[PDB]
Structures are given as structure tokens and as C-alpha cells.
Amino acid sequence: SRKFFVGGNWKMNGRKQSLGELIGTLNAAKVPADTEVVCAPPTAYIDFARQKLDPKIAVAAQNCYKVTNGAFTGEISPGMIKDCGATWVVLGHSERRHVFGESDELIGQKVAHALAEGLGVIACIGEKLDEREAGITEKVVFEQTKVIADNMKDWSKVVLAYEPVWAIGTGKTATPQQAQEVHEKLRGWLKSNVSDAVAQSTRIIYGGSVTGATCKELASQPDVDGFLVGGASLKPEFVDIINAKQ
Amino acid sequence: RKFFVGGNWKMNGRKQSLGELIGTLNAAKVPADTEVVCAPPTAYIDFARQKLDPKIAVAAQNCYKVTNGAFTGEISPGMIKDCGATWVVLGHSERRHVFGESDELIGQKVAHALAEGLGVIACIGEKLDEREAGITEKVVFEQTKVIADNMKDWSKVVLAYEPVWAIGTGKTATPQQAQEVHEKLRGWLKSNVSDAVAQSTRIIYGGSVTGATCKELASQPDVDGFLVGGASLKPEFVDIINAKQ
């Protein structure tokens, strides 16, 4: 019985005043008890957000590096994330992979280390438009998921996020049925390559375009276990997406 | 040119350990002729500014080139200002050589940070292969050039020379080898920008500095301070603050 999971990726948006407002909205919101809600602030505001947010909402970092301390100007470690009261980290996000060039190997290593330090991990995967139009969706997301899997001792604190990069900013839209086709193929990969236990208990959430209007239909897909929300996570509309199963 | 001592904590510390360091720094007597800046890890910019006495300025360790946007894991100069920090380090050797940040990207970041009202510590330097091939000047001049082309105003910039060729290589820089590069960089400012920019721009040294070495390095005519690494996490940093005393 996989617990429904809604992530809010704020990305590089907001200041203390505006995020303070957003947080007041989320605190005033009724969160269903059967739903796990997580918010990822810009790294400068992880501490700030954890202090202001009600305990019913967990806090994620948006990225981290692969050792606990070191000569890595501009990076943060999982220890720092935990030290700030955050319990999750988002890793392998399409923007890290495709804007900032983070390799599969680097990401697998980040997952191992964040997991070894006690954080949950939202591990992101997905294919670009050129990869999808070349017919290599499965090949790409399976390879990304394999590299993550090779750097794991334990699956219980991982959530997989499928991002259709091919449908973010390109003009193309993704159907609920296309999302479901990728999600069930990823679950089938977990069953045949890790275990049926992992396949049946691991949340696979959809990180493509989600709104107050699209969320109910997407969430009723049997292999779509929730959402990693982009722009809408900055709006009160997020509260509708939290309630997508209601 | 006011003497400038920067402390780059890198990816080190927690609230407890950094709170302790900050107590130590808050007890230090900062000379009137010296500008002190500390760069915490990004998760602790806010924490550090709240705990530090105002006689010490706070810097971000990196930032991005737009004020808000779809850039998971980044921070903007707006957020840095919002947390009470007045500087950012850009083009650090680690951003360049571990994380692949290009000259063009760094230039764009410099322009955006200066425009949003931050000071910028702009880092340049050559690797060992480049030094031993004889292209020290080519590499550092190119890096300073691409930056200069993305800037109009020089008053809020500090140039940091990093002898990357001395990090974990088995080679080290002498004070004289540091002076030599600082002099050539001031030379490039004269010839490529102006004499005025060349006479007023702090050029600080970003290689190994300790309490034992700091006074000899600071006495070099073209070395105007430091961007300190490992020693910045220790009381020894307070002695490096006193380098020109």
C-alpha cells in the first residue's frame, strides 16, 4: 500500500518574504494523513524553510555532493542537509543533468552517499525529445535507473521521479496514458532487476507538467504514485495537487 | 588599495563547528586598514550572517546569472543579498576544474552579480600542464579577458590568482612566483582596460597561506591580500587577518 507522495520543487525562485507567504499558505492547508508532502527550497533557504514550515511538511535540498566535507567550493553535503533539519534530497534532476552536465556516474555516487548519511532521495530520470523521437525512451530511463540501482544497499528511502524532458519547454504535451506507460515499464524493470518487493513498494512519481486541472487524472493511473511539481509548487494551486487522490 | 582577506570555508562545517569558528572570529580585532570577508557553505550563508559581527562581511561561494528561474540547485545574487551577504566568489578553481564552469558562464555571472549590487571575488589561475607548457600568461590573460568583456564597472571587483598548479601536485609557489604573476595581471589591466583600473583593483593571492607565510606574501608590492582555504576554518585565520600589521 504505497503512500501517495507530493514534492514541491521551488527551483531558483523566491526570497524570504515571498517564500514566507508561500509557507503560510502551506501551513494553513489541510494535508491528507495518507499523503507524504515534501518541499525543496533554494539552498540558501533550506534552514529558513524548515524553521517556518509545520512538521507535517518535510524539507528537501535541491542537490548535494558525494562526500561529507571537502574542497568543493559551492557544494553542500548530506550532513549539512540533515544539520539544517531536512530529511530529503532531490538528485539527478533534469536541470542538473542537462543544463549543468551532471553524469549518471556522479549521480549514482551522490545517491549512495546521501542514503548512507540517512537522507531520503528523490532520484530523477527521463529522456529528451531527440531520445524519444529516436525510439530510445526505455533504453535511456532503464540505463539511468540501473546506474542508481548499482549504488544502493537499501531501497526503502528512495523515490523515483520520471521527468518527460521531451515534454518540458518543447511545445509537446504528454498524456496521462504516456506517463502510465513509462511508469509501469520502470516498475517492471525494478521487478525483473532488483526485486518484486522493491517494485511493489517504491513510489514512482511523475515530474512532467502538473496542475490543479491535470492532477486528478494523472494520479488515478495505477503506476503514478504522486508528483514532483515544478512552477505550480510556488502557487496555492499546490494544495489541490496535494489533494489529487481526495 | 585596501588590504583584503577572504576566507573560503568550502564544503566544510556544521552549525555547531561553524558557530564555534564564528565566536573566534568575532573576538578578533580587525585592523582599520583591512577588509575581511568569509564565504560559508551555501546552506549556512544565512546562519553565518546572523551570528557574525558586522566587521566581517559574508560571501556566497557561487551563484547563477539570473534573478529567478528553473535552475534546480542554483542561487541568485538576489537571494544572497536577501540573506545579508554582500559578496560572491566566482570562477573558483573548483567550479572551473571539478564542475566544468566555462569562461563565458563565469563572465555572465560576474555581470549579473555586479548589476544586482554584489561585490565579486573573481578567480583565475593556471594548471600544472599549462604552467609547464609555458602558457601561464595565455591562460590567466584569457580568463581575465572573458571576465573584463562581461563587465563595465571595476570598483566592486577583486581579482584572485589561484596557482592551481600548486594544489596537490607536489609543486609550490614561492612569494616571488606569486609576485611575478600578480605583476603580469596588473600589467594586463593597464594595457587592456586602463591605468586607473590597474592601480585600484585588489589582486589577492589564492594559493597556500598560513600564519607562518602571510606577512612575507602580503609584503610583495602587487599582492593585496588573500583568498584563504584550509586555514580559514581555524583561529590561524585571525593571524592572517593581521598580515599587513
Q: Cβ–Cβ of A12/B100 closer than 8 Å?
A: no
- In the block, residue with C-alpha cell 503560510: A24
For residue B43, give the amino acid letter.
A
Q: Cβ–Cβ of B43/A84 closer than 8 Å?
A: yes
For residue B206, give the amino acid letter.
G
The residue in chain B having the minimum alpha-carbon distance to the alpha carbon of residue A96 is B72
Measured CA to CA, the distance from residue B144 to residue B159 in angstroms comes to 9
Residues 6+ positions from A150 with CB-CB distance below 8 Å: A108
**3-state percent helix, strand, coil for chain A, nearest multiple of 5:** 45, 15, 40
Method: X-ray
Q: Cβ–Cβ of A12/B76 closer than 8 Å?
A: yes
Among this protein's residues, is A184 annotated catalytic? no
Catalytic residue, from A36, A95, A127, A163: name it. Answer: A163
Q: Cβ–Cβ of A71/B94 closer than 8 Å?
A: yes
Active site (catalytic) residues of B: 92, 162
Residues 6+ positions from A181 with CB-CB distance below 8 Å: none
Instruction: Identify from B72, B97, B112, B164 which residue to disrupt to test chain A contact, counting A C-beta atoms within 10 A and taking the largest count.
Output: B72
The residue in chain B having the minimum alpha-carbon distance to the alpha carbon of residue A11 is B72
Residues 6+ positions from A239 with CB-CB distance below 8 Å: A25, A26, A29
DSSP string, chain B: --EEEEEE--B---HHHHHHHHHHHHHS---TTEEEEEE--GGGHHHHHHHS-TTSEEEES---SSSSBS-TT---HHHHHHTT--EEEES-HHHHHTS---HHHHHHHHHHHHHTT-EEEEEE---HHHHHTT-HHHHHHHHHHHHHHT-S--TTEEEEE--GGGSSSS----HHHHHHHHHHHHHHHHHHT-HHHHHHSEEEE-S---TTTHHHHHTSTT--EEEE-GGGGSTHHHHHHTTT-
- Chain B contact set for A15 (CB, 8 A): 78-79, 82
Q: Cβ–Cβ of A75/B12 closer than 8 Å?
A: no
Q: Binding residue per annotation — A9?
A: yes
Give the nearest partner residue to B82 out of A16, A43, A72, using CB atoms: A16
Name the minimum distance, in Å, from the CA of A145 to any CA of chain B.
20
Count A/B contacts: CB-CB distance under 8 Å: 128
Does residue B140 contact residue B185 with C-beta atoms inside 8 Å? yes
- Chain A contact set for B43 (CB, 8 A): 43-44, 46-47, 61, 76, 80-81, 83-84
